[PDB]
Amino acid sequence: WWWHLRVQELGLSAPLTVLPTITCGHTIEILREKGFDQAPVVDEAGVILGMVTLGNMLSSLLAGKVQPSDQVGKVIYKQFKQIRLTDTLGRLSHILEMDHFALVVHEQIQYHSTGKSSQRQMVFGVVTAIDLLNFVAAQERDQK
Amino acid sequence: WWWHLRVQELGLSAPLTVLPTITCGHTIEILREKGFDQAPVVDEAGVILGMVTLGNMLSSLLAGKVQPSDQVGKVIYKQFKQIRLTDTLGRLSHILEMDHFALVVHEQIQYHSTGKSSQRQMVFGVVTAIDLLNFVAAQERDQK
Amino acid sequence: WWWHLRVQELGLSAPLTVLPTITCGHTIEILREKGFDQAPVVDEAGVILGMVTLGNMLSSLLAGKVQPSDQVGKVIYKQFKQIRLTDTLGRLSHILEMDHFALVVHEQIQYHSTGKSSQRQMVFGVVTAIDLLNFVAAQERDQK
Amino acid sequence: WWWHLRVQELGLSAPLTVLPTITCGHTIEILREKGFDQAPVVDEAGVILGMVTLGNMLSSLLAGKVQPSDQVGKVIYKQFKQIRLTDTLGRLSHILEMDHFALVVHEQIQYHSTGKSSQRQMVFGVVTAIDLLNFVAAQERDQK
Amino acid sequence: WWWHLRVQELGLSAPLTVLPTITCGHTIEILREKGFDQAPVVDEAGVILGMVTLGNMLSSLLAGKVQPSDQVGKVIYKQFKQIRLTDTLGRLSHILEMDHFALVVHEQIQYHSTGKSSQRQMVFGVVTAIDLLNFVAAQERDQK
Amino acid sequence: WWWHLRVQELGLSAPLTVLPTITCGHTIEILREKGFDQAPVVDEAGVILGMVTLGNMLSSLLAGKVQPSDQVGKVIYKQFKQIRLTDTLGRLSHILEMDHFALVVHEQIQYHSTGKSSQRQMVFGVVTAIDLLNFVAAQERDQK
Amino acid sequence: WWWHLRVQELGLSAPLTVLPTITCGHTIEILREKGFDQAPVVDEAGVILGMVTLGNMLSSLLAGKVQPSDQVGKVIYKQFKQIRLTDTLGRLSHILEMDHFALVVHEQIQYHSTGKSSQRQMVFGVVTAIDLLNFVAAQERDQK
Amino acid sequence: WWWHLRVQELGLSAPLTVLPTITCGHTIEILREKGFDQAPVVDEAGVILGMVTLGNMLSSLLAGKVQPSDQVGKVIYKQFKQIRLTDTLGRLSHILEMDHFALVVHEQIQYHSTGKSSQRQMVFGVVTAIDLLNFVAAQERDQK
Amino acid sequence: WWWHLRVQELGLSAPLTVLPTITCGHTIEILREKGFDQAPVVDEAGVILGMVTLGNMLSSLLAGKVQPSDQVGKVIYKQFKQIRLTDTLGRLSHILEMDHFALVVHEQIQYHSTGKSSQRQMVFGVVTAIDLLNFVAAQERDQK
Amino acid sequence: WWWHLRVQELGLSAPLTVLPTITCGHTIEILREKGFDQAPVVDEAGVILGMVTLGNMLSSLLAGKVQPSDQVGKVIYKQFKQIRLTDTLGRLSHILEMDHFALVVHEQIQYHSTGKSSQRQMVFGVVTAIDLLNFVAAQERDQK
């Protein structure tokens, strides 16, 4: 039944993200002390530009390309199956199987001095099935 | 009953915002062509830095401080009441009671090259009672 | 300079109004898709008998007096700052300065079988600020 | 140059119209004391249901169809080269070139309880070249 | 029955007539506030030499032949058909059913020491169907 | 250099594990609030009889066998490239890449009444990349 | 210098243990032929519940409480001083210097069907100074 | 019962003994691989001049007096509860009650060139209770 | 039955040997006072370098090889069928039977500074049938 | 030189003898603690009838012919070499060489009232090479 549900309901309390210049070893700590596993990589403007995960992180360091002291900009995960918040859990349940996570985007349309429109994409969160499992374990009392 | 409803459920399709350098005259067009009157004023990084409304802009143009060719950066509406998307309708409905509009924000905590957290507030969108009315009109069908 | 202009100069094209029996939400949907905010409440004869505005409507709905399914007549915003089309832009601009909207009316005198005179008032149009702001933006391309 | 100008500029302070039930002897009187030539005929709802002119009337009286005590509604004039106030003076000029009068109208879009649109034609006023001649001496001080 | 009624018995209001030198517009604005449409042009005494109307002026002015600032002499409408006061209402019907007005003349036969018979055809006035309609309305009161 | 390091040094403070009867949703909660990802499934005697990981378990919920209220015993996950505690980081670096984790085994040789030996495998912990990733940063101060 | 060292480096390959049910004499034989002196006593679940030593044996066997053919659980040594593997070598130093043998333990906490937690204590390896002396004579080759 | 028996019956294994100058670690390894707990210290002539024990040796390094590479004559133990082969098992068992081992000695009456009598003490071997317990483990099947 | 018995169970009386540097006359003296038939000859280190018997003396004195003042090392007897202290009494009795004396030796495996294994041999004692004949009367009360 | 010596100087103090009925072990014990090997067996008057040694007695006991409890008379060794005291030491020494003992007999030459001379040969004693060895050792002191 849960696949009926929608992305926004899932409580993406995930404001955390990184710059590409963050030291690899530091991110390793932050995720673990938080218990997290993957962190979004954006610019200081917040523009979505990549990902970082242990799976590529361990693979990269063990590949010998970088040190833990290196910056994540050079080991940036980018192949995320990113989804939109407006979508349903079925798509989430679909996508979140081949890998543990996927980005949810929020779109931002700015207009220039001359009224010319522009588009900015923002991070709504970084979700995993735990959020799905956590949410599905409780909310079924209300809108099942 | 609807005041219990959760804010993110309100179907905000509101990515449009403006740079402060946009000309007032063009600004009116974009809102009026959209049927809008108020729009977020943000930087190129999406920094929540003010507003623009009907009363803000009508008073400003009638006061003569901004010509129609003037930029909105001079008269950016600032006294907006603001809510968070994780909040509830009842307070937002309360919030909308004494204003024409309300701002919803979001947060995104970037982490430095040194791994230090840095919190950035990000625009979620712009809500007027139409959004509440439009959704509660839909909730007439969804309360099943 | 524009405030000296005649009210009729603006050209408030749309004469869109409602009867006091249409469902509250239905009014809201019609205005919102078109982006409107208000609608004159007149009889089938067209006699100006009131107004309805979202600021009243949001307050009315949140007051609990009307469901969205309720009729619009019971929340008739019959009070309005009303001006005549034969009047000056500045005073209407003055009128809109501290109001969410303004009303203009069209007079009409009928003579019965005995020729005794009568008076009727039709709606010339409904004006908000963005009428003027767009109009002065357009008109200053011709007369300025 | 004036023929290019908009209809509404011509100061059409002409709200007077009659019910069809008014007698012949009173219609002539009012138009005579007003110095008028013709008078619109509408219902109590303002529906544009006819006309009456000296040419229509004189032909009617001299044909014997209406006694002076008879109603103008029996011989209600209804033909006219009707125009709408959004148009230009040249078309008004064009229409008045061969008719003995010109008719201008106005619109009102009422909406029912079911949200169904209803465009209602409404009288704006009666115009003759006097309105042109009176006002042509005026705009040659404003736009000329 | 009224067709028998004597033209003299109608009781024209009065003659109003100007000299050809004065401009059209000044005559035009005067006649209209009296409600008039057509005005004679005579010599220093009242001899028939000219005739002006709105119908020909509007036709001529929009044709561009003369301006409203042009003298009233160039808008002459003397091609009228003319009647004598000794005739009856029926003759007016045979006149006014087509034209917009009728001319009635009169003789001011003053006698002097010049030694010859004198004849000076005066203008008796300007009569329209309103006079006819007023006269038949009045005669229906006399014949009561 | 780190592959020189030995498995024993890593310090897996990982005594936590589960029974097969543990509730599915409770299982995910337990790891999540603590921030873990997977915990061994053993009996009350500590026998290494299973494993629970989100990737199978998210698939397990999507397979429909388990609701969050279900037990993990019916979806007990039992494949793991388990490593031995005496090895080096080279094996860990090798083994721990193709999956996110691997069991580390302690062993126990119990002797019967007749002196017959009996080997019993024990869980020394549950390791992922962080354990070494944190450790490699630390071990550059002690052994290298 | 070695006293600083970590216990787990000491090659504590002592998975062997006994059930209480086995006779005393065989256990003494078992440790004798394999060369040990003392062996840990646990249940079939591997729960640490006792010990057996030469003094625990000879004194009891000379006390007459047990025949050599008597069961070993009768003389289960339990007054050992106990340490955890996570400690340092100097902690072993001030343990074996007065005790004739040393016990080390490993911990394991299991989580129930209801999610409640319970710890299990598991033997790591029965160690005496020879391991230390063997290890310290060996590890200095790694350092130097 | 066995305490009535005779020491010589026990059947010692062998006299594995060392010189004082032997390295501490080599004795440590030798007793390890042999499983032994101690070894007598004698000269090349076999004179009973010392002993080396686990408790002596563990205390020796941990007191810092000898490195593992140092020679054992520095810590030469001689406080053994020495016994003679001719003595009884019960006394030996009593003798082993507090010491972890008991030296068994042997005599040799060597005469000189002049016939002067002299006694040369000889090491018969080394015994722990494990000898006795194993010894009684079989003797109860033949001499009982 | 006694032939089944063992060296150690039979037991020695006492060991007495001498250096070869003793004179022949005193060798007779010590044996004759003891009634001994023979004597082992070793160094002060106890190495079994020879022995002396009655048959050695009778041949030696009557061959003129040694005077009583001469040393036995001149004619130190060397023939002897050496036996070990592990051997069945029947063999001992057999092995003694054809000879006139027999010797049992005791092993002594000592280790050097470099821990190199080395086995020296030690004299256990001299045995004649008296050792058998006296003890056989005793073990018939112990084994029988 | 000693071959000149005689039994009269020999000092054979060997008068002890046994009866044939005495038990072998009883004779064995007596001979052993005095330290002899061979024992004379004579009648109650001292007349020569028997002789025994250990060499045959052990051999006979090992042959199974007699037990140690058997009488000494059945284990006789009379196949000795017998000598007379009048014979020189050289012949004495010569004759004892190829054995372990020799017999010397007593032939006193006085008689009694029986009326006839005869011979009742008593044993003079039991000499060994040790006697000679003791004798030659002593006589070397006497002659020098």
Ligand SMILES: C[S@@+](CC[C@H](N)C(=O)[O-])C[C@H]1O[C@@H](n2cnc3c(N)ncnc32)[C@H](O)[C@@H]1O
């Ligand atoms: C505690 S971690 C558990 C580790 C597991 N491998 C995973 O990624 O889900 C999961 C929780 O952390 C939160 N989280 C994941 N990524 C995050 C991020 N980049 N910033 C802040 N929170 C995040 C999610 O809301 C999720 O509920």
Ligand SMILES: C[S@@+](CC[C@H](N)C(=O)[O-])C[C@H]1O[C@@H](n2cnc3c(N)ncnc32)[C@H](O)[C@@H]1O
């Ligand atoms: C249809 S307009 C009606 C006029 C109304 N007074 C207003 O502008 O907010 C309102 C709708 O547009 C959306 N909206 C308002 N401001 C917006 C903005 N700045 N960018 C994008 N959408 C916006 C809101 O969600 C609301 O549902």
Ligand SMILES: C[S@@+](CC[C@H](N)C(=O)[O-])C[C@H]1O[C@@H](n2cnc3c(N)ncnc32)[C@H](O)[C@@H]1O
């Ligand atoms: C496209 S709408 C823009 C959205 C905004 N709510 C509004 O109505 O102004 C612009 C025009 O709608 C007109 N308008 C507003 N209320 C009206 C009403 N009740 N009937 C007809 N026109 C109306 C305004 O005068 C304005 O010129």
Ligand SMILES: C[S@@+](CC[C@H](N)C(=O)[O-])C[C@H]1O[C@@H](n2cnc3c(N)ncnc32)[C@H](O)[C@@H]1O
């Ligand atoms: C003052 S009369 C004089 C001109 C001429 N008598 C005629 O009626 O055409 C004409 C003026 O009266 C006004 N008028 C004409 N008919 C009208 C009517 N039916 N109701 C109100 N005003 C009217 C027109 O604006 C026009 O400017």
Ligand SMILES: C[S@@+](CC[C@H](N)C(=O)[O-])C[C@H]1O[C@@H](n2cnc3c(N)ncnc32)[C@H](O)[C@@H]1O
């Ligand atoms: C409004 S006018 C009659 C309508 C006619 N179409 C006109 O406007 O001239 C009303 C009265 O004015 C009078 N009248 C018309 N023209 C006149 C003139 N030129 N001088 C004096 N009276 C005039 C007529 O007698 C008529 O009774």
Ligand SMILES: C[S@@+](CC[C@H](N)C(=O)[O-])C[C@H]1O[C@@H](n2cnc3c(N)ncnc32)[C@H](O)[C@@H]1O
């Ligand atoms: C904060 S969790 C992050 C998620 C990680 N993939 C995991 O294994 O759960 C990382 C730490 O949790 C610890 N851990 C993992 N499984 C555990 C378990 N079953 N019991 C106790 N600790 C565990 C590991 O030692 C690791 O250092």
Ligand SMILES: C[S@@+](CC[C@H](N)C(=O)[O-])C[C@H]1O[C@@H](n2cnc3c(N)ncnc32)[C@H](O)[C@@H]1O
């Ligand atoms: C080689 S034996 C030497 C004799 C020693 N005195 C002792 O305590 O047994 C000692 C070795 O056996 C190992 N050991 C001790 N107890 C053991 C047990 N119960 N099972 C398996 N190994 C054990 C220890 O780690 C130590 O390294």
Ligand SMILES: C[S@@+](CC[C@H](N)C(=O)[O-])C[C@H]1O[C@@H](n2cnc3c(N)ncnc32)[C@H](O)[C@@H]1O
């Ligand atoms: C075979 S080891 C068995 C291992 C056991 N941990 C121990 O040392 O007792 C035990 C045997 O070795 C013998 N032994 C002990 N120390 C000895 C030594 N220094 N030289 C020769 N044998 C020794 C003991 O007499 C005992 O019978």
Ligand SMILES: C[S@@+](CC[C@H](N)C(=O)[O-])C[C@H]1O[C@@H](n2cnc3c(N)ncnc32)[C@H](O)[C@@H]1O
């Ligand atoms: C007591 S004498 C018995 C009678 C006779 N003298 C003989 O030797 O057979 C023999 C005993 O002395 C002991 N013995 C023999 N030669 C010895 C020697 N060289 N040193 C010490 N004891 C010896 C033997 O153990 C034997 O039990």
Ligand SMILES: C[S@@+](CC[C@H](N)C(=O)[O-])C[C@H]1O[C@@H](n2cnc3c(N)ncnc32)[C@H](O)[C@@H]1O
């Ligand atoms: C000391 S024992 C040992 C010598 C010899 N191997 C033996 O066993 O007969 C020998 C001495 O005892 C003495 N002797 C031998 N037989 C004897 C006997 N039957 N009675 C008394 N003395 C005897 C001899 O004189 C000799 O000096």
